[PDB]
Design an enzyme around this catalytic site. Structure first.
Site, PDB file in Angstrom:
ATOM      1  N   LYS A   1      15.567  -1.136  13.378  1.00 51.66           N
ATOM      2  CA  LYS A   1      16.476  -2.257  13.566  1.00 51.66           C
ATOM      3  C   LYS A   1      17.622  -2.138  12.549  1.00 51.66           C
ATOM      4  CE  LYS A   1      13.762  -5.590  10.960  1.00 51.66           C
ATOM      5  NZ  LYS A   1      13.229  -6.985  10.991  1.00 51.66           N
ATOM      6  N   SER A   2      18.745  -2.842  12.788  1.00 49.67           N
ATOM      7  CA  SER A   2      19.919  -2.800  11.903  1.00 49.67           C
ATOM      8  C   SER A   2      19.660  -3.406  10.527  1.00 49.67           C
ATOM      9  CB  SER A   2      21.133  -3.417  12.582  1.00 49.67           C
ATOM     10  OG  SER A   2      20.895  -4.799  12.735  1.00 49.67           O
TER      11      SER A   2
ATOM     12  N   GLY B   1      18.786 -11.300  -1.205  1.00 48.18           N
ATOM     13  CA  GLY B   1      18.273 -11.459   0.148  1.00 48.18           C
ATOM     14  C   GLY B   1      16.791 -11.183   0.281  1.00 48.18           C
ATOM     15  N   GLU B   2      16.179 -11.757   1.340  1.00 50.82           N
ATOM     16  CA  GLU B   2      14.766 -11.590   1.691  1.00 50.82           C
ATOM     17  C   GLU B   2      14.647 -10.456   2.710  1.00 50.82           C
ATOM     18  OE1 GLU B   2      12.088 -15.177   2.054  1.00 50.82           O
ATOM     19  OE2 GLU B   2      13.951 -16.304   1.706  1.00 50.82           O
ATOM     20  N   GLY B   3      13.475  -9.826   2.777  1.00 55.41           N
ATOM     21  CA  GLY B   3      13.238  -8.711   3.691  1.00 55.41           C
ATOM     22  C   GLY B   3      11.813  -8.543   4.177  1.00 55.41           C
TER      23      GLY B   3
ATOM     24  N   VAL C   1      14.169  -9.100  -2.210  1.00 57.55           N
ATOM     25  CA  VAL C   1      14.874  -8.123  -3.037  1.00 57.55           C
ATOM     26  C   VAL C   1      15.695  -8.780  -4.140  1.00 57.55           C
ATOM     27  CG1 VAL C   1      15.541  -5.707  -2.772  1.00 57.55           C
ATOM     28  CG2 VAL C   1      15.343  -7.140  -0.744  1.00 57.55           C
TER      29      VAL C   1
ATOM     30  N   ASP D   1       9.599   0.164  13.277  1.00 56.45           N
ATOM     31  CA  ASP D   1      10.474  -0.999  13.073  1.00 56.45           C
ATOM     32  C   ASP D   1      11.985  -0.617  12.910  1.00 56.45           C
ATOM     33  OD1 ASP D   1      11.011  -3.730  13.101  1.00 56.45           O
ATOM     34  OD2 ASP D   1      10.031  -4.178  11.165  1.00 56.45           O
TER      35      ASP D   1
HETATM   36  C1  LIG Z   1      12.706  -1.087   1.883  1.00 58.93           C
HETATM   37  C2  LIG Z   1      14.171  -0.968   1.537  1.00 58.93           C
HETATM   38  F1  LIG Z   1      14.480   0.344   1.398  1.00 58.93           F
HETATM   39  C3  LIG Z   1      14.399  -1.587   0.192  1.00 58.93           C
HETATM   40  N1  LIG Z   1      15.778  -1.818  -0.133  1.00 58.93           N
HETATM   41  C4  LIG Z   1      16.419  -0.898  -0.931  1.00 58.93           C
HETATM   42  C5  LIG Z   1      17.673  -1.082  -1.361  1.00 58.93           C
HETATM   43  C6  LIG Z   1      18.366  -2.309  -0.988  1.00 58.93           C
HETATM   44  N2  LIG Z   1      19.618  -2.445  -1.446  1.00 58.93           N
HETATM   45  C7  LIG Z   1      20.246  -3.585  -1.120  1.00 58.93           C
HETATM   46  N3  LIG Z   1      21.554  -3.765  -1.592  1.00 58.93           N
HETATM   47  C8  LIG Z   1      22.374  -4.814  -1.328  1.00 58.93           C
HETATM   48  C9  LIG Z   1      22.011  -6.076  -0.803  1.00 58.93           C
HETATM   49  N4  LIG Z   1      23.065  -6.876  -0.651  1.00 58.93           N
HETATM   50  N5  LIG Z   1      24.086  -6.117  -1.084  1.00 58.93           N
HETATM   51  C10 LIG Z   1      25.394  -6.728  -1.042  1.00 58.93           C
HETATM   52  C11 LIG Z   1      25.797  -7.503  -2.270  1.00 58.93           C
HETATM   53  C12 LIG Z   1      26.884  -8.471  -1.833  1.00 58.93           C
HETATM   54  N6  LIG Z   1      28.016  -7.762  -1.218  1.00 58.93           N
HETATM   55  C13 LIG Z   1      28.922  -8.790  -0.721  1.00 58.93           C
HETATM   56  C14 LIG Z   1      27.640  -6.948  -0.053  1.00 58.93           C
HETATM   57  C15 LIG Z   1      26.524  -5.973  -0.374  1.00 58.93           C
HETATM   58  C16 LIG Z   1      23.738  -4.862  -1.510  1.00 58.93           C
HETATM   59  N7  LIG Z   1      19.702  -4.549  -0.367  1.00 58.93           N
HETATM   60  C17 LIG Z   1      18.462  -4.402   0.108  1.00 58.93           C
HETATM   61  N8  LIG Z   1      17.912  -5.418   0.918  1.00 58.93           N
HETATM   62  C18 LIG Z   1      18.727  -6.511   1.470  1.00 58.93           C
HETATM   63  C19 LIG Z   1      19.672  -6.159   2.573  1.00 58.93           C
HETATM   64  C20 LIG Z   1      19.079  -7.694   0.613  1.00 58.93           C
HETATM   65  C21 LIG Z   1      18.016  -7.817   1.661  1.00 58.93           C
HETATM   66  C22 LIG Z   1      17.740  -3.263  -0.207  1.00 58.93           C
HETATM   67  C23 LIG Z   1      16.348  -3.023   0.250  1.00 58.93           C
HETATM   68  O1  LIG Z   1      15.763  -3.846   0.934  1.00 58.93           O
END
Ligand SMILES: C[C@H](F)Cn1ccc2nc(Nc3cnn(C4CCN(C)CC4)c3)nc(NC3(C)CC3)c2c1=O
Length: 278
Positions: free
Chosen positions: A139-140, A28-30, A35, A137
């Protein structure tokens, strides 16, 4: 202090930033980055590939500045850094946004889990406000969830230590009226949290263009005018919500969502209110 890593070391883990959906490295994008799922032997990591040249670099720096200073169970953990990359502990359950919308087939959160996440997020905002920081910022999409669905406040690129600014930044669907005016205040974080709470109650995103009302915060006005009630808007994807604690969470969100910033409760009072709810 904290761990620092080289660009040549992190270029490898990502499998050379292979932007691919994990359903068949892009998870995913953020905001201002993207990421990717990374590794360091037996501990999985998240790599924030960052994409104004001077201000994107200062958002990368402030994140390292706030993270080194702020450590709490309800805040994400920064592991490393460095074209720019930021390295974190991989949050197994992603964002509250994605879990509220059941993205990628994940099961709906129960009311019981929703309450712990709300208390968790309030404790993390409390720690930030105690250490004289304004998130800017809330947000959910910025509330991440670990292996036990513990809420973790993320993204500090816009974080600040009743002052005004020229360049207004944040998410408009979550912003306080005074924040939209240029003001910087911890009271604006309380308003944004009020919107998160409504997303938790309703399971609805803060904004949906193909919906009426477009803005979730408008439902507060529909309820007060007795046009509708909270029961009309409770997320139907739960079997364990009880009116007493649902009306008690709504009362906290309603209080947070006051138009006048000084009429809003402090984070310690919000924290106190969510504890009385359970
Ligand atoms: C600044 C911030 F702390 C940085 N950070 C730190 C950690 C982190 N960890 C995840 N873990 C993650 C994402 N998808 N899943 C899924 C895998 C598929 N499964 C079906 C459900 C769970 C688990 N995602 C992140 N970003 C998002 C949300 C992708 C954009 C971040 C992130 O942005």
């Amino acid at each position: 202090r904290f761990h620092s890593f080289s660009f040549y070391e992190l270029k490898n883990v990502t499998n050379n930033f292979d932007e691919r959906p994990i359903s068949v490295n892009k998870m995913g994008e953020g905001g201002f980055g993207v990421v990717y799922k990374g590794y360091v032997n037996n501990t999985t990591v998240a790599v924030k590939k960052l994409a104004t040249t001077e201000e994107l670099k200062q958002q990368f720096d402030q994140e390292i500045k706030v993270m080194a200073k702020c450590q709490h169970e309800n805040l994400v953990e920064l592991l490393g850094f460095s074209d720019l990359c930021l390295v974190y502990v991989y949050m197994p359950n992603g964002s509250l946004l994605d879990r509220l919308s059941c993205l990628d087939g994940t099961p709906p959160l129960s009311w019981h889990m929703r309450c712990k996440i709300a208390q968790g997020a309030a404790n993390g905002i409390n720690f930030l406000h105690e250490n004289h920081h304004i998130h800017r910022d809330i947000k959910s999409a910025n509330i991440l969830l670990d292996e036990a669905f513990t809420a973790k406040i993320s993204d500090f690129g816009l974080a600040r230590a009743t002052v005004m600014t020229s360049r207004i930044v944040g998410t408009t669907a979550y912003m306080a009226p005074e924040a939209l005016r240029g003001e910087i205040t911890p009271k604006s974080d309380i308003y944004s949290f009020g919107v998160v709470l409504l997303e938790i109650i309703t399971g609805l995103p803060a904004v949906d263009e193909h919906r009426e009302p477009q803005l979730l915060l408008d439902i507060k006005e529909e309820i007060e005018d007795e046009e509708k009630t909270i029961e009309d808007y409770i997320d139907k994807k739960m079997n364990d919500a009880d009116s007493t604690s649902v009306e008690a969470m709504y009362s906290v969100a309603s209080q947070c969502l006051h138009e006048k910033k000084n009429k809003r409760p402090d984070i310690k009072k919000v924290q106190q209110l969510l504890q009385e709810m359970t």
